Nucleic acid binder design. Structure first.
Lengths: 80, 92, 21, 94, 103, 99, 78, 98, 92
DNA sequence: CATTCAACTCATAGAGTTGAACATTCCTTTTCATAGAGCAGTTTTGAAACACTCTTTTTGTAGTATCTGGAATTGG
DNA sequence: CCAATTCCAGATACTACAAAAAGAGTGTTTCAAAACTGCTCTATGAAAAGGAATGTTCAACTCTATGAGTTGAATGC
């Protein structure tokens, strides 16, 4: 839809739940999933923007995201 | 021959509550808290300095580490106190 | 619910696991 | 129908959310934090962010369905996700 | 002529400077980093001590015990989030009983 | 009528005190037995503060785990605690916080 | 039979402080096993810390370091 | 005229590990056997992971290892899964669980 | 100019599997794994040396850190491998 | 986006199970002395181990030219 | 659904080369062994009292089958 949060459609959430092993889902799950994703993104993006603006840059780098995830207790191996 | 923060904690307590004492176990807990926070902030500042290829720890690294470690209002007030102390110290 | 020496509002941790609109 | 879908999805390894909506949402959330300045983004950064988010969501769904099966039902509810976030303890569920 | 007095603080500056120099953190240390760190530490200590003193005074006491420190820490969301994986000896728990159990 | 709810006052009194609940001598015996089972054949000494700290940590861990397990019990629609609640709580807490 | 020294009333007191109202009979053995696993892990770490130095007495700082290395911080015995 | 990694009978580099230890401000001094020990441990862990990855690749009629095989090898082992408990593999997927 | 562990990973892969290749993302994942384990062991050894008031990091600190960090059989086999490597390197 | 109906959730009551409450007792933990001594803490020092510097070679590390495993489509 | 063909992206193989690490020597420093001192851990004795253990009982708790009301996975465009 017009709002950017509505871009995460129901088919994608359904596919994520099916990959997780879920068999039957309720209607109220999609808004909760959107809110949880929003909180996660807010935390990670705040940390990454702090890391970016500590240096005198204007472009967000993958290493900033990796450092934010690592300092929050979540190691990522692919984009190192 | 041991070191602690007892006198400074007592001075702060006398500044906040002029008619209140404290036990020994609470003083040990306060010492532990101070040491823990010091270790956290210093480690984060060291990591920040290593990421950007620098060999110096300045007040900017400390400020960024404080912003990274403490939650919102605590971080804001701590940054305020830190910059206030710095500008009062450099003007003497 | 409490204003310290510095005007920082000290709030009680009511709830954090529920999504609020 | 659902069984074949689950069995096929548990074997693949590609991303499930589109790139453009995720990019738009991430850019608006990033511009909300700064003082109005617009930051540029690399493609690898957005890819890493999407990978991390999707892994987190899949693991949380697994935990929530464990809770759902414990509660005696087969349909997932929001309170299962809430209780999983609460039990995870203020650092992993948030 | 003390540095802590020059910065208007109660916490020591020379001690923090020495601990930073002998802590294996970096090859060089600036001049305002110990002042910043001491100010932040004193602010946090003052906040915790004020909350604990208020708890002890409301509890009709005169001396602060670890129970008051626990009550002060666990009743502030930011301090609780900061000290999330810390255990206080002889602190106890908060009086929290589920409403479903109580009539 | 013998006692309507003595558990209520018991919980209300226990949640206000801050003293240890397990005796010291059995805890010391169990700790020494485990420690001698870990080392090859040597018998190590123990300071009193070490045993006190170990007991404090263990009791805090057990109380927190009981809180989480009772949360799971209430979610399951019951008022009586079961071992499956503790097991599921450990499983959801994970490999480190669930041992 | 040192594991039997942890009596039923002590487990009852712990569960009551935790907020539990009713307890089943099969819980005491489970609690004993969980406590045994916890003690085994912590004591293994503490004994490693102790024998790294050339000592034969377990100290409080060894237990504190062993707890910290597992994500648990203790303040009272620093 | 003679490599130290060949002196220790290893494949991982010893001088590079020694330099990385010296420039990481871990302590003011570094011994002589610490880099050898560390390189040996790292090579052992690498070989242990790669053997299971190759087995998982062969069990699917493949001749090239992809991240999926690494994920399978790591999650199908007890101690390896315990060691890498807070790590996310990119493009690795999940394990089939009902 | 960048640095990685690609050549050594390829060497040990040709040692364990003569007729198997590897992609680039897998090589990046292996590099990340090696760096992570290096950092863990080095930090543990550093804090161990600091606890006992020492200014040197030796193979004893590395062995104690390995025993503290790896699970049972992994730790036993890694200790055996490291001891064998040090014994072979000393007799030269 | 519009339907739908087979697949779910939810409330209730009867059959079976059991854990909290209580009297009594005696055993096990706790408290007040008491050294003995095994083990921990302090001081010197010196020989071996580690850091610092210049030179040269060798090895990773990008660039360039070939080879092939893997993915797609069509047909049986 | 599996098997065979063909195409091309993505591997492997192949070279120059420059900078990083041994070789050798020299200066610094530090940590284990020995002697001494002290300290607190442990094993022992004498009372004692209160808290754990046995046994019994009954109201409180759980399990389960069933009918009433709700909904979301499948389908076509």
């Amino acid at each position: 839809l017009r709002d950017n949060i509505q871009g995460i459609t129901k088919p994608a959430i359904r596919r994520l739940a099916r990959r997780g092993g879920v068999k039957r889902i309720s209607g109220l799950i999609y808004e909760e999933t959107r809110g949880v994703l929003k909180v996660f993104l807010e935390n990670v993006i705040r940390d990454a923007v702090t890391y970016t603006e500590h240096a005198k840059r204007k472009t967000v780098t993958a290493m900033d995201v990796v450092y934010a995830l690592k300092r929050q207790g979540r190691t990522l191996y692919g984009f190192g | 021959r041991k070191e602690s923060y007892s006198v400074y904690v007592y001075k702060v307590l006398k500044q906040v509550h002029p008619d209140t004492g404290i036990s020994s176990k609470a003083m040990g807990i306060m010492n532990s808290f101070v040491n823990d926070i010091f270790e956290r902030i210093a480690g984060e500042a060291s990591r920040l300095a290593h990421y950007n290829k620098r060999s110096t720890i300045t007040s900017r690294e400390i400020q960024t580490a404080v912003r990274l470690l403490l939650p919102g209002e605590l971080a804001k007030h701590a940054v305020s106190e830190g910059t206030k102390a710095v500008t009062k110290y450099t003007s003497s | 619910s409490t204003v310290t020496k510095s005007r920082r509002i000290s709030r009680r941790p009511s709830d954090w696991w529920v999504v609020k609109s | 129908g659902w069984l074949k879908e689950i069995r096929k999805l548990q074997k693949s390894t590609h991303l499930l959310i589109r790139k453009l909506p995720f990019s738009r949402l991430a850019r608006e959330i990033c511009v909300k934090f700064t003082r109005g300045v617009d930051f540029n983004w690399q493609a690898q950064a957005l890819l890493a962010l999407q990978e991390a988010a999707e892994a987190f969501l899949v693991h949380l769904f697994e935990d929530a369905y464990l809770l759902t099966l414990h509660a005696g039902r087969v349909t997932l509810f929001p309170k299962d996700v809430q209780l999983a976030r609460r039990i995870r303890g203020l650092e992993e569920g948030l | 002529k003390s540095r802590s007095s020059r910065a208007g603080l109660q916490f020591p500056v020379g001690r923090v400077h020495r601990l930073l120099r002998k802590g294996n953190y970096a090859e060089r240390v600036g001049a305002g980093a110990p002042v910043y760190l001491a100010a932040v530490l004193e602010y946090l200590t003052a906040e915790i001590l004020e909350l604990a003193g208020n708890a002890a005074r409301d509890n009709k006491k005169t001396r602060i015990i670890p129970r008051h420190l626990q009550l002060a820490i666990r009743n502030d969301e930011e301090l609780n989030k900061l000290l999330g994986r810390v255990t206080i000896a002889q602190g106890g728990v908060l009086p929290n009983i589920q409403a479903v159990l109580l009539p």
